[PDB]
């Protein structure tokens, strides 16, 4: 099970580095910067499409997998939420394609790309639902093979998209990578025969829909905080300097997201299920502290190694046209430690399913990101964004400990 997840995370990382490298070598810092706001929208779609209930889907599919009547209502209401929201999403993308292009790119020259997303997001919503269902039925193999195939065809789709369409093709490729996974997930769901197909018939259970709505509010809150913040910050950096300067700072985040993904799963399936079962404050503190005793030195060592080979990392994963960001590593990699450090406090809020505290944590990150950006970015450029990213999580980590200590007492 956990080795299936490792296989998925590995192929996903390798393919992500591969497509990230090809995008860098082909379109340079201007392309990496211009594409970042578009890549921010795709990940949000993976978070907030099909009502963003797929975390709750897997939880309740496994909870009611023994009761056939309640299992059918869970999958049935999940398909209904996906169908309704995927269709409304399509209408939103065809009618507001120009204003969405403006917010993401600064001009309306990407309307056709935004309108095409209306069809692409359907594969993301339906694909992630089929993956969530396979996770709920404890099918780690069917989940992993679907992700591996989806990553393999995503590289093929991205290569053909950018060769034909140019830069806007490469952007379409970045959306097609998570959307095409619905092809192997569907084929795997069929032949593995774990889930009856009639269960996918859209029905509506007001009980499960309201409970699954709480997962929708989480994705809603998540999608309109840090993504919105990072969008305005890259836009302000581009306006005061250039999109080429945004790609300098974007290359730093793109390099860190590689090793920061494997460490994420090291305290995801190992920490989140454990923090849910425990109920005593002493036992909560005994695992919050002991998780930091492993997570902090692990990211510190990994990030320090990246800074030790900052020149090699730039040359390897990107191009020597990104050499200017070697000075950004010290500030961003520090902020990475404090950000992942505060993740332990974030997964504690998710384990308690506290919407109140989840809202407070996301807006805290959003605010600190916005204040520190209006001061650093207009003066220091990409270094200002890397300094705002570090100043944010230096304060946010310290606030997270104070909030935890008050809550602990």
């Amino acid at each position, epitope marked *: 099970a956990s080795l299936w997840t490792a296989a998925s995370t590995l192929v996903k990382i390798g393919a992500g580095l591969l497509v990230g490298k090809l995008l860098a070598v082909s379109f340079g810092p201007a392309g990496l910067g211009l594409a970042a706001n578009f890549r921010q929208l795709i990940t949000v779609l993976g978070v907030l499409a099909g009502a963003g209930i797929f975390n709750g889907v897997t939880k309740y599919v496994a909870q009611y997998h023994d009761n056939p009547q309640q299992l059918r209502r869970v999958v049935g209401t999940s398909s209904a939420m996906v169908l309704g929201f995927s269709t409304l999403m399509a209408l939103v993308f065809v009618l507001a394609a120009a204003p969405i292009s403006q917010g993401l790119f600064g001009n309306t020259d990407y309307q056709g790309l935004v309108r095409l997303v209306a069809l692409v997001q359907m594969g993301i919503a339906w694909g992630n639902l089929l993956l969530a269902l396979m996770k709920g039925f404890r099918d780690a193999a069917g989940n992993a093979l679907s992700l591996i195939v989806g990553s393999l065809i995503g590289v093929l789709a991205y290569y053909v998209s950018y060769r034909l369409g140019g830069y806007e093709g490469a952007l379409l490729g970045l959306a097609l990578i998570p959307a095409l996974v619905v092809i192997p997930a569907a084929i795997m769901l069929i032949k593995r025969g774990v889930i009856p197909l009639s269960y996918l018939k859209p029905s509506w259970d007001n009980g499960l829909a309201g409970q699954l709505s709480k997962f929708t509010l989480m994705a809603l809150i998540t999608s309109v905080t840090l993504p919105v913040a990072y969008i305005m910050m890259r836009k302000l950096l581009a306006a005061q*300097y*250039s999109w080429d*300067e945004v*790609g300098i700072w974007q290359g730093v985040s793109s390099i860190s997201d590689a090793y920061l993904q494997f460490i994420t799963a090291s305290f995801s399936v190992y920490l989140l299920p454990t923090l849910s079962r425990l109920t005593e404050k002493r036992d909560i503190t005994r695992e919050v502290v002991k998780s930091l005793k492993f997570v902090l030195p692990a990211v510190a060592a990994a990030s320090f190694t990246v800074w030790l080979l900052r020149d090699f990392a730039i040359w390897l994963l990107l191009s020597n046209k990104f050499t*200017a960001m070697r000075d950004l590593f010290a500030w961003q990699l520090v902020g990475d430690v404090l950000k992942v450090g505060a993740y332990v406090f974030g997964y504690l809020v998710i384990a308690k399913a506290s919407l109140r505290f989840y809202i407070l944590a996301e807006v805290s990150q959003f605010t600190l990101l916005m204040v520190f950006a209006h001061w650093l970015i207009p003066a220091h*450029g990409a270094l200002g964004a890397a300094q705002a990213y570090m100043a944010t999580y230096i304060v946010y980590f310290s606030l997270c400990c104070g909030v935890f200590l008050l809550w602990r007492r």
Partner: nanobody
Framework: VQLVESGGGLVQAGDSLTLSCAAS????????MGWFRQHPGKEREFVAS????????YYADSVKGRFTISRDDVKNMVYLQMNSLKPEDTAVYYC?????????????????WGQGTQVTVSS
């Protein structure tokens, strides 16, 4: 760092000319550069500058489209390729430097300066 300029001289209207600023010192990649012009008896004015990362360049209205500023970090040289020269460009040209800078129009935002080179253009 120390800046030593060259490349100026007397040219006719409409011809090109390239000015070179040789920076002598270490960590020249972390330094942003700017080109300034000065009329006899008037203050120094902004012509062009490059961001210290080398991704962004800034030009004045009377300059944009005509002159091009670039850098060669292998030789620690900064260039000002002037193309459609006109008598209005007749001045003394200074190259300036600033650590983690190069995005200002004011001369006070530049620490190190060059000796200056005279560019005169007739007709």
């Amino acid at each position: 760092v120390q800046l030593v300029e060259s490349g100026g001289g007397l040219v006719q209207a409409g011809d090109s000319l390239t000015l070179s600023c040789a920076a002598s010192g270490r960590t020249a990649y972390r330094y942003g550069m700017g080109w300034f012009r000065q009329h006899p008896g008037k203050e120094r004015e902004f012509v062009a500058s490059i961001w210290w990362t080398g991704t962004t360049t800034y030009y004045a209205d009377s300059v944009k489209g005509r002159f091009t500023i670039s850098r060669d970090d292998v030789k620690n040289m900064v260039y000002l390729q002037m193309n459609s020269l006109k008598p209005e460009d007749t001045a003394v040209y200074y190259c300036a430097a600033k650590f983690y800078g190069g995005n200002s129009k004011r001369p006070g935002d530049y620490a190190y300066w060059g000796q200056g080179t005279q560019v005169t253009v007739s007709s």
